[PDB]
Amino acid sequence: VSKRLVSYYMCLERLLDEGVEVVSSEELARRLDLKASQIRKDLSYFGEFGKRGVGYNVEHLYDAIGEILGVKKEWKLVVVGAGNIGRAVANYTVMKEKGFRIIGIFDSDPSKIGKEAAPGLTVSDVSELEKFVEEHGVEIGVIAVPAEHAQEIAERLEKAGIKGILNFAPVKIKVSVPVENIDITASLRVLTFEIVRRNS
Amino acid sequence: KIPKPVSKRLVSYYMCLERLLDEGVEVVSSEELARRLDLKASQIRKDLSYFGEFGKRGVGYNVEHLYDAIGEILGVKKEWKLVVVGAGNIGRAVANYTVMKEKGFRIIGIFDSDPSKIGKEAAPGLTVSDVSELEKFVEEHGVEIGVIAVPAEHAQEIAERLEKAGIKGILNFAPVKIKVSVPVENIDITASLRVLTFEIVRRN
Ligand SMILES: NC(=O)c1ccc[n+]([C@@H]2O[C@H](COP(=O)([O-])OP(=O)(O)OC[C@H]3O[C@@H](n4cnc5c(N)ncnc54)[C@H](O)[C@@H]3O)[C@@H](O)[C@H]2O)c1
Numbered sequence: 303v304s305k306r307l308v309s310y311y312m313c314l315e316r317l318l319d320e321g322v323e324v325v326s327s328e329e330l331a332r333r334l335d336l337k338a339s340q341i342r343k344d345l346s347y348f349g350e351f352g353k354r355g356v357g358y359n360v361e362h363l364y365d366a367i368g369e370i371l372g373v374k375k376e377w378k379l380v381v382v383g384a385g386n387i388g389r390a391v392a393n394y395t396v397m398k399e400k401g402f403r404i405i406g407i408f409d410s411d412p413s414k415i416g417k418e419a420a421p422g423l424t425v426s427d428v429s430e431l432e433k434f435v436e437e438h439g440v441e442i443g444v445i446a447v448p449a450e451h452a453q454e455i456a457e458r459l460e461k462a463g464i465k466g467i468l469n470f471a472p473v474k475i476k477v478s479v480p481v482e483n484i485d486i487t488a489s490l491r492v493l494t495f496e497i498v499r500r501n502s
Numbered sequence: 503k504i505p506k507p508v509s510k511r512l513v514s515y516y517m518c519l520e521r522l523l524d525e526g527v528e529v530v531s532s533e534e535l536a537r538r539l540d541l542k543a544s545q546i547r548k549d550l551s552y553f554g555e556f557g558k559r560g561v562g563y564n565v566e567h568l569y570d571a572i573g574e575i576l577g578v579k580k581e582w583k584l585v586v587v588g589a590g591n592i593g594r595a596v597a598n599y600t601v602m603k604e605k606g607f608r609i610i611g612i613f614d615s616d617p618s619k620i621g622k623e624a625a626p627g628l629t630v631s632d633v634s635e636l637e638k639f640v641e642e643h644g645v646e647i648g649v650i651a652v653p654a655e656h657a658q659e660i661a662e663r664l665e666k667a668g669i670k671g672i673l674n675f676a677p678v679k680i681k682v683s684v685p686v687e688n689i690d691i692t693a694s695l696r697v698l699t700f701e702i703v704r705r706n
């Protein structure tokens with residue numbers, strides 16, 4: 303699955319950066335916090351091409367999963383909201399190195415429009431969001447606006463032809479395009495549930 | 503006699519009860535929960551009997567009572583103490599997140615190794631502390647959750663220090679797998695972008 307494929311990809315990529323050639327299912331099981339039977343079952347999708355002896359060829363799986371995930375493609379991004387989240391994301395320098403290029407950032411606050419959210423990036427007026435998205439063919443919109451305005455902002459991106467939405471606002475966006483939510487509070491909540499379970 | 507429902511199904515009830523409240527449902531039946539949670543109606547009644555009559559209203563279950571009683575069991579009414587390690591883009595944005603205290607999470611300290619950042623305000627009322635005192639601060643204040651907002655190359659090191667200081671859990675923003683004896687929730691923005699783009703291409 304997508305989340306599981308990405309999890310394998312991040313692990314194997316760190317493994318290649320270290321320089322490791324072969325990784326065992328048990329090392330994968332520990333690194334991914336998964337069962338060794340599931341590690342072998344998931345990776346059996348790549349057949350004997352993904353294995354070297356008892357272990358797994360790190361570069362083969364990394365290249366094969368990178369192909370599935372389409373990691374060679376670059377993506378145009380816009381960030382709606384020049385607040386805490388929007389600026390932190392816009393200033394993540396290596397994001398462009400991973401193939402995700404933020405080319406526009408928008409906000410409805412006159413004090414911040416015209417300011418520099420990041421080197422080479424100027425906050426634009428959210429009134430020009432649809433025009434900017436259609437003109438530049440932006441594929442992914444990053445919603446860093448409040449939860450009340452999130453559905454509206456999402457509708458604006460969808461009407462303007464956005465292909466996907468990365469949503470930081472704590473609300474279930476109702477829209478046709480794929481949405482990936484980063485809910486920091488919910489992630490903290492999920493963590494607490496596991497904390498309560500272990501200390502019960 | 504009536505056993506406490508396991509955490510995994512408590513969480514399932516909680517999220518289902520949350521959706522019901524958003525829909526405006528005040529009373530829900532065992533069969534509706536059986537349908538929405540894919541469980542035996544018999545099992546729904548055995549699980550919810552843990553909350554006695556307090557969980558029930560009329561012909562069904564009191565959604566509000568169950569949401570708050572299950573949330574209480576899951577620590578939703580408990581104000582969790584957080585520290586943030588790393589006072590950069592992520593750490594400052596998390597430290598500046600206004601209403602997180604209202605949601606139940608209070609950052610009482612933020613730490614960094616940069617002497618140019620230490621002693622400045624990461625957020626109004628919050629001073630960047632020297633990461634040298636990280637363990638002592640966590641132990642003294644009984645900090646539960648550590649938010650790792652440092653670069654990946656130092657993330658494992660920070661996690662072990664939090665672990666040694668008795669941290670209960672870790673929210674990790676650094677794109678690495680953390681190996682510690684406490685639970686870890688990863689938030690990987692790049693991974694989330696990769697999931698999103700894969701689903702975009704999948705629809706074609
Ligand atoms: N910062 C966190 O750690 C955190 C945690 C959990 C959730 N979130 C969610 O992430 C989102 C962003 O939070 P933040 O901390 O960056 O908020 P923030 O207040 O710092 O920034 C929000 C920005 O959105 C802008 N904005 C508001 N309405 C707009 C509109 N219609 N069009 C364009 N811009 C608009 C505001 O001017 C502001 O600059 C929020 O929805 C928040 O609930 C953030």
Ligand SMILES: NC(=O)c1ccc[n+]([C@@H]2O[C@H](COP(=O)([O-])OP(=O)(O)OC[C@H]3O[C@@H](n4cnc5c(N)ncnc54)[C@H](O)[C@@H]3O)[C@@H](O)[C@H]2O)c1
Pocket residue numbers: 390391392393394587588589590591592593613614615616619633650651652653654656660675676677690691692
């Ligand atoms: N900003 C994003 O959008 C984004 C996206 C994906 C991942 N991340 C990950 O989140 C983490 C933080 O990102 P950021 O953009 O805030 O980075 P940043 O460089 O802005 O913050 C790093 C901070 O950590 C501090 N630090 C470094 N080593 C430390 C140590 N041993 N102890 C304490 N503090 C230390 C630095 O002084 C710096 O202030 C990184 O791991 C990054 O890869 C961030």
